[PDB]
Amino acid sequence: EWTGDARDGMFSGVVITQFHTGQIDNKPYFCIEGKQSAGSSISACSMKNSSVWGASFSTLYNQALYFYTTGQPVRIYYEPGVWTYPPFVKALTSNALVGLSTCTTSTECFGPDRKKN
Amino acid sequence: EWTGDARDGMFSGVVITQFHTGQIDNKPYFCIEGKQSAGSSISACSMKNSSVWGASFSTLYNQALYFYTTGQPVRIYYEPGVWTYPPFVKALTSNALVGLSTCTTSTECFGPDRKKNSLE
Amino acid sequence: EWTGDARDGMFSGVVITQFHTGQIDNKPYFCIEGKQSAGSSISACSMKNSSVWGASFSTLYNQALYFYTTGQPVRIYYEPGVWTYPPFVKALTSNALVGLSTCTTSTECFGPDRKK
Amino acid sequence: EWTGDARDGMFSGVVITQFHTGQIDNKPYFCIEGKQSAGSSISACSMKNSSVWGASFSTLYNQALYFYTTGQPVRIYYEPGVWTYPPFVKALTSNALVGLSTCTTSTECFGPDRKKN
Amino acid sequence: EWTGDARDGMFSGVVITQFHTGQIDNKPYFCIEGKQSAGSSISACSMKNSSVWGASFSTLYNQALYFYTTGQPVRIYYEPGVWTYPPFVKALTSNALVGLSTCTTSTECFGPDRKK
Numbered sequence: 243e244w245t246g247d248a249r250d251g252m253f254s255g256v257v258i259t260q261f262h263t264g265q266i267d268n269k270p271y272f273c274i275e276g277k278q279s280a281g282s283s284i285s286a287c288s289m290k291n292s293s294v295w296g297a298s299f300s301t302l303y304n305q306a307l308y309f310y311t312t313g314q315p316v317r318i319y320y321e322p323g324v325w326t327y328p329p330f331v332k333a334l335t336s337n338a339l340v341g342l343s344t345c346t347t348s349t350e351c352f353g354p355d356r357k358k359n
Numbered sequence: 360e361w362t363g364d365a366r367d368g369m370f371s372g373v374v375i376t377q378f379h380t381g382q383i384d385n386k387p388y389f390c391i392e393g394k395q396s397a398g399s400s401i402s403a404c405s406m407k408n409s410s411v412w413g414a415s416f417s418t419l420y421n422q423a424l425y426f427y428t429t430g431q432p433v434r435i436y437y438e439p440g441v442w443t444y445p446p447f448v449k450a451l452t453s454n455a456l457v458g459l460s461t462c463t464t465s466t467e468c469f470g471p472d473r474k475k476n477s478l479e
Numbered sequence: 480e481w482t483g484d485a486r487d488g489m490f491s492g493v494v495i496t497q498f499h500t501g502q503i504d505n506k507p508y509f510c511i512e513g514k515q516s517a518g519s520s521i522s523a524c525s526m527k528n529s530s531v532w533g534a535s536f537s538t539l540y541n542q543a544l545y546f547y548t549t550g551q552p553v554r555i556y557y558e559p560g561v562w563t564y565p566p567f568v569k570a571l572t573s574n575a576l577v578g579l580s581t582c583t584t585s586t587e588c589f590g591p592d593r594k595k
Numbered sequence: 596e597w598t599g600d601a602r603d604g605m606f607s608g609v610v611i612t613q614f615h616t617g618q619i620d621n622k623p624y625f626c627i628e629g630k631q632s633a634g635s636s637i638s639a640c641s642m643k644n645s646s647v648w649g650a651s652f653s654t655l656y657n658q659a660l661y662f663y664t665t666g667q668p669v670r671i672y673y674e675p676g677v678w679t680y681p682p683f684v685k686a687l688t689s690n691a692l693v694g695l696s697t698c699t700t701s702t703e704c705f706g707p708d709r710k711k712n
Numbered sequence: 713e714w715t716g717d718a719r720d721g722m723f724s725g726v727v728i729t730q731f732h733t734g735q736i737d738n739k740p741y742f743c744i745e746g747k748q749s750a751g752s753s754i755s756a757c758s759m760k761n762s763s764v765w766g767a768s769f770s771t772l773y774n775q776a777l778y779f780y781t782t783g784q785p786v787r788i789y790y791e792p793g794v795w796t797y798p799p800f801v802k803a804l805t806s807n808a809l810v811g812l813s814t815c816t817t818s819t820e821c822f823g824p825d826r827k828k
């Protein structure tokens with residue numbers, strides 16, 4: 243697996259506006275929310291030691307909190323349908339956070355595309 | 360367990376005003392105090408490798424110190440009665456810190472509620 | 480053991496003015512010095528993986544550097560007579576750093592008392 | 596191996612302008628891009644626990660994020676042809692980030708040279 | 713071994729002006745350079761998992777970058793002759809970075825002397 247696999251999905255030019263940290267089944271996690279210029283929203287969580295994407299927890303937490311601080315538009319890479327506990331999904335999201343990138347415009351960001359072919 | 364379990368409890372729109380760090384029984388811990396809009400205090404502690412919320416010590420420590428620094432109003436998620444050692448509970452609190460969120464208002468915050476259901 | 484044990488000691492309303500990091504016996508350590516408004520001085524060191532207080536090294540280092548940075552008055556919790564290598568005691572202190580707290584006044588600070 | 600080995604290569608006086616963070620094969624990696632002025636581009640990635648240069652991940656992550664933040668001109672030490680997963684190389688680079696230095700001019704920087712004879 | 717052992721050496725009132733980070737033989741290292749007002753110069757490296765001073769790499773890294781950022785005059789504790797690989801010594805230095813202190817003056821700084 244790779245952040246840049248040809249899959250859903252990515253949102254570009256988002257400002258990270260909300261941040262949550264919790265624990266579930268002995269695993270710390272965090273979630274972010276961001277809006278695009280046009281008002282469109284994306285949420286994604288990263289959980290320590292959980293899923294394929296568990297290895298990225300610390301790096302993503304650090305980078306997410308950095309970008310939440312600067313408030314610069316970034317690209318959120320995510321994978322839908324990873325989290326399955328229904329209370330969790332309802333309150334938050336099923337989307338795993340799978341990478342992050344700075345952006346030069348609202349559509350053009352540094353790094354791979356993550357789109358279904 | 361889960362931060363968002365329908366249990367006590369949460370305090371929304373809290374400003375983290377006080378920060379303490381210590382050690383008990385070979386385990387580092389930190390405690391925070393925050394104020395709500397009307398002047399009431401909340402306190403909650405996280406302890407490394409403790410009972411059920413110990414796995415979140417590092418994340419919570421970093422996030423709480425971060426929010427202390429910004430002075431942002433935030434949601435404190437806690438579980439009452441976790442710490443049982445009387446001198447500790449007396450000086451500090453029995454509350455474990457189990458989560459944190461940013462808030463859009465003094466009352467509306469990102470993430471799950473941590474709240475007991477009502478009886479209809 | 481506990482930071483809040485009824486033991487020596489604590490200094491409240493201290494601004495951390497000095498900071499030192501080094502190594503002894505394959506362990507990193509740090510020391511801080513601070514003065515109260517009253518000019519009364521306090522030094523205390525934390526050592527990584529040390530006997531009793533070593534589990535706290537990482538949190539205390541983080542918090543102490545943080546407090547050194549803001550310049551805010553804080554409570555220094557300490558245990559005297561912990562470090563014993565004589566050249567180390569002589570140059571620095573025997574005091575272990577055992578906790579830290581923010582303060583509201585020169586005497587009132589968040590957290591427990593540490594006093595006999 | 597050593598950052599300052601006489602091989603390809605280094606780019607001096609680079610301002611880091613782009614930052615990307617992702618995961619591949621159970622490993623977090625970050626990737627940076629900078630401009631010399633000059634005006635030409637260098638990208639390099641570091642990856643946690645990667646084979647040769649993985650020991651340096653956490654140090655380089657910190658240091659690169661630091662330098663991205665200050666915007667100061669820095670030396671990027673790189674090793675070409677390290678990353679080999681072709682879609683990764685295509686979207687990003689094959690270059691491993693193997694060192695960083697502060698610079699006094701566009702060309703003069705602290706530390707070893709990394710260049711072939 | 714100790715930062716405060718009666719050996720070479722230390723330079724007081726040094727502003728850390730240059731910073732380098734790299735890897736050699738599967739170990740990360742960083743090096744700093746600084747000048748002390750009269751313009752006398754000092755270089756020192758810390759390397760993770762080296763036989764003697766390796767334990768303090770990440771603490772010294774953190775502290776030195778912190779001091780590079782504030783630009784305050786500090787004390788550099790070093791031990792000469794630690795790095796032996798000749799191209800490394802030629803490009804950088806043989807000096808191990810052994811400790812760091814805040815300073816109150818260009819000559820007086822917090823902590824032990826490291827003096828032969």
Ligand SMILES: O=C(CO)N[C@H]1[C@H]([C@H](O)[C@H](O)CO)O[C@@](O)(C(=O)O)C[C@@H]1O
Pocket residue numbers: 250251252253254255278282349356357
């Ligand atoms: O189709 C999806 C599903 O995640 N995402 C696309 C994404 C979304 O359709 C769009 O951002 C929603 O507003 O648009 C992109 O232009 C982008 O934001 O980078 C490309 C991206 O593939």
Ligand SMILES: O=C(CO)N[C@H]1[C@H]([C@H](O)[C@H](O)CO)O[C@@](O)(C(=O)O)C[C@@H]1O
Pocket residue numbers: 367368369370371372395399466473474475
């Ligand atoms: O009743 C409790 C027990 O913790 N908590 C409630 C809590 C407290 O009653 C209140 O914060 C204390 O004044 O009020 C809430 O409006 C909130 O702050 O989110 C709802 C929350 O469920």
Ligand SMILES: O=C(CO)N[C@H]1[C@H]([C@H](O)[C@H](O)CO)O[C@@](O)(C(=O)O)C[C@@H]1O
Pocket residue numbers: 487488489490491492515517519586593594
């Ligand atoms: O006597 C000692 C020895 O540490 N400490 C006391 C301490 C010192 O006497 C005082 O701070 C020294 O100036 O005064 C306290 O009011 C405080 O600073 O919190 C109470 C504390 O027990």
Ligand SMILES: O=C(CO)N[C@H]1[C@H]([C@H](O)[C@H](O)CO)O[C@@](O)(C(=O)O)C[C@@H]1O
Pocket residue numbers: 603604605606607608631635702709710
């Ligand atoms: O030839 C290469 C291949 O990395 N790089 C050289 C590099 C390139 O010629 C230059 O950066 C243009 O890409 O110039 C240097 O002056 C430098 O930037 O330090 C020396 C460096 O060895």
Ligand SMILES: O=C(CO)N[C@H]1[C@H]([C@H](O)[C@H](O)CO)O[C@@](O)(C(=O)O)C[C@@H]1O
Pocket residue numbers: 720721722723724725748752819826827828
């Ligand atoms: O002899 C050495 C070898 O490092 N260093 C001395 C050192 C150097 O001679 C001096 O810093 C070089 O300008 O001067 C000191 O005043 C100091 O800077 O603390 C004392 C120190 O022991």
